[PDB]
Enzyme design. Structure first.
Site, PDB file in Angstrom:
ATOM      1  N   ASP A 181      37.096  25.881  49.538  1.00  0.00           N
ATOM      2  CA  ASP A 181      37.507  26.752  50.634  1.00  0.00           C
ATOM      3  C   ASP A 181      38.802  27.471  50.305  1.00  0.00           C
ATOM      4  O   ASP A 181      38.954  28.652  50.615  1.00  0.00           O
ATOM      5  CB  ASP A 181      37.672  25.936  51.933  1.00  0.00           C
ATOM      6  N   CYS A 215      30.102  37.635  46.779  1.00  0.00           N
ATOM      7  CA  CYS A 215      30.801  36.568  47.509  1.00  0.00           C
ATOM      8  C   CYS A 215      31.015  37.120  48.915  1.00  0.00           C
ATOM      9  O   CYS A 215      30.113  37.778  49.430  1.00  0.00           O
ATOM     10  CB  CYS A 215      32.077  36.156  46.776  1.00  0.00           C
ATOM     11  N   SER A 216      32.178  36.861  49.527  1.00  0.00           N
ATOM     12  CA  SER A 216      32.534  37.459  50.813  1.00  0.00           C
ATOM     13  C   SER A 216      32.634  38.977  50.712  1.00  0.00           C
ATOM     14  O   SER A 216      31.835  39.717  51.306  1.00  0.00           O
ATOM     15  CB  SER A 216      33.872  36.892  51.310  1.00  0.00           C
ATOM     16  N   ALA A 217      33.623  39.439  49.946  1.00  0.00           N
ATOM     17  CA  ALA A 217      33.934  40.863  49.749  1.00  0.00           C
ATOM     18  C   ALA A 217      33.291  41.461  48.489  1.00  0.00           C
ATOM     19  O   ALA A 217      33.224  42.702  48.341  1.00  0.00           O
ATOM     20  CB  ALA A 217      35.459  41.041  49.681  1.00  0.00           C
ATOM     21  N   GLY A 218      32.793  40.618  47.588  1.00  0.00           N
ATOM     22  CA  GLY A 218      32.277  41.095  46.311  1.00  0.00           C
ATOM     23  C   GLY A 218      33.331  41.584  45.328  1.00  0.00           C
ATOM     24  O   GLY A 218      33.039  42.462  44.511  1.00  0.00           O
ATOM     25  N   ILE A 219      34.532  41.007  45.340  1.00  0.00           N
ATOM     26  CA  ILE A 219      35.535  41.419  44.346  1.00  0.00           C
ATOM     27  C   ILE A 219      36.198  40.224  43.671  1.00  0.00           C
ATOM     28  O   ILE A 219      36.630  40.322  42.515  1.00  0.00           O
ATOM     29  CB  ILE A 219      36.610  42.335  44.976  1.00  0.00           C
ATOM     30  N   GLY A 220      36.295  39.092  44.370  1.00  0.00           N
ATOM     31  CA  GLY A 220      37.124  38.000  43.892  1.00  0.00           C
ATOM     32  C   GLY A 220      36.389  37.006  43.023  1.00  0.00           C
ATOM     33  O   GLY A 220      36.458  37.057  41.790  1.00  0.00           O
ATOM     34  N   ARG A 221      35.702  36.052  43.658  1.00  0.00           N
ATOM     35  CA  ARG A 221      34.843  35.153  42.898  1.00  0.00           C
ATOM     36  C   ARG A 221      33.857  35.940  42.069  1.00  0.00           C
ATOM     37  O   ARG A 221      33.563  35.580  40.916  1.00  0.00           O
ATOM     38  CB  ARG A 221      34.108  34.201  43.849  1.00  0.00           C
ATOM     39  N   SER A 222      33.305  37.001  42.653  1.00  0.00           N
ATOM     40  CA  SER A 222      32.317  37.805  41.945  1.00  0.00           C
ATOM     41  C   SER A 222      32.917  38.403  40.676  1.00  0.00           C
ATOM     42  O   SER A 222      32.243  38.538  39.649  1.00  0.00           O
ATOM     43  CB  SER A 222      31.816  38.934  42.835  1.00  0.00           C
ATOM     44  N   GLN A 262      41.235  38.754  42.898  1.00  0.00           N
ATOM     45  CA  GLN A 262      42.004  39.010  44.113  1.00  0.00           C
ATOM     46  C   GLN A 262      43.352  38.313  44.135  1.00  0.00           C
ATOM     47  O   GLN A 262      44.210  38.685  44.944  1.00  0.00           O
ATOM     48  CB  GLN A 262      41.236  38.524  45.346  1.00  0.00           C
TER      49      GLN A 262
END
Ligand code: FRJ
EC number: 3.1.3.48
Length: 286
Positions: A181, A215-222, A262
């Site tokens: 999380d 992912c959530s926004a498609g920039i970080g984990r992705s 991010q």
């Protein structure tokens, strides 16, 4: 290994935030006019995460062709990726239309539907074989075929049917379920394992359309997923693997979608993944 020592240098000096800010200030800025049209405001999850016009994925519907999704093309690595946001209740049909139109074989999901007590994306795949989903707006049917739950990820086989042509396609859903999380994983081992299981499925290979990653926004984990994949592929392709500069690769990917990676912690984790993946290849058996 020049990268591992750069890593110790940055760690010892505690300068991850410094390096990350340099990347932010060097990153490309391109227009995102379509994303900001008022008619598209409820197709975006976050006010500040928009696809650039030049790399955005277009839906094949004259109506409104907009989806918050970008094509990342890595010429030297010969890899392409579609990075997108977690679908919204009103964009689940658009999401699967994109998968269909782009001929993708895999969908990579790096978040849980609920994290931190809040909803991070819509439940966009069916949870039981006998309860299929129909997306009336884009005329698609989605059936759960099988589901294999493992310790750190789940893999699902899905059948996607274009109700207009009665064509069907098998889609693999690769769902990494154990990203914490808060922060990043302590070890990259399970993430690297996941990545190479996606590879062995064929979902990243050139005979298929680009993999869809979110992912959530498609920039970080992705972003961490694509960066690690591309870096490891380049180290296998070049005569000198130590010439691969993760910062330069990251800046090239940021020409195609803003914000990839991010936080400075995600940047450090990305280095660690590449390093440990490289070291695993150097000790590989057979
Ligand atoms: C390169 C990708 C990869 O990188 C990894 C790194 C780890 S790690 O975090 O635990 N770090 C690590 C772990 C072990 C070693 S090692 O010294 O033991 N080298 C090898 N042992 C067997 C083959 S290679 C070196 C580094 C674990 C697993 C992997 C891993 C895999 O899980 C994996 C690798 C391959 Br190649 C593959 O085809 C698949 Br499927 C999975």
């Amino acid at each position: 290994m020049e990268m591992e020592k750069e890593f110790e240098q940055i760690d010892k000096s505690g300068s991850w935030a410094a390096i990350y800010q340099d990347i932010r200030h060097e990153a490309s800025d391109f227009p995102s006019r379509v994303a900001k049209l008022p008619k598209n405001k409820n197709r975006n999850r976050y006010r500040d995460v928009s696809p650039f016009d030049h790399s955005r994925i277009k839906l094949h519907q004259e109506d409104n062709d907009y989806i918050n999704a970008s094509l990342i093309k890595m010429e030297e690595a010969q890899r392409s990726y579609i990075l997108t946001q977690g679908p919204l209740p009103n964009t689940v049909g658009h999401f699967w239309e994109m998968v269909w139109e782009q001929k993708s074989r895999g969908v990579v999901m790096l978040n849980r539907v609920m994290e931190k007590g809040s909803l991070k994306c819509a439940q966009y795949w069916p949870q039981k074989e006998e309860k299929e989903m129909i997306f009336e707006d884009t005329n698609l049917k989605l059936t759960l075929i099988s589901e294999d739950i493992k310790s750190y990820y789940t893999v699902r086989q899905l059948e996607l049917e274009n109700l207009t042509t009665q064509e069907t396609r098998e889609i693999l859903h690769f769902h990494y379920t154990t990203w914490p999380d808060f922060g990043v994983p302590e070890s990259p081992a399970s993430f690297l394992n996941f990545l190479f299981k996606v590879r062995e499925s064929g979902s990243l290979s050139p005979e298929h359309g680009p993999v869809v990653v979110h992912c959530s926004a498609g920039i970080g984990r992705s972003g961490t997923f694509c960066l690690a994949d591309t870096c490891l592929l380049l180290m296998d392709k070049r005569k000198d693997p130590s010439s691969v500069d993760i910062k330069k690769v990251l800046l090239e990917m940021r020409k195609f979608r803003m914000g990839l990676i991010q936080t400075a912690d995600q940047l450090r984790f990305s280095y660690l993944a590449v390093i440990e993946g490289a070291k695993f290849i150097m000790g590989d058996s057979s």
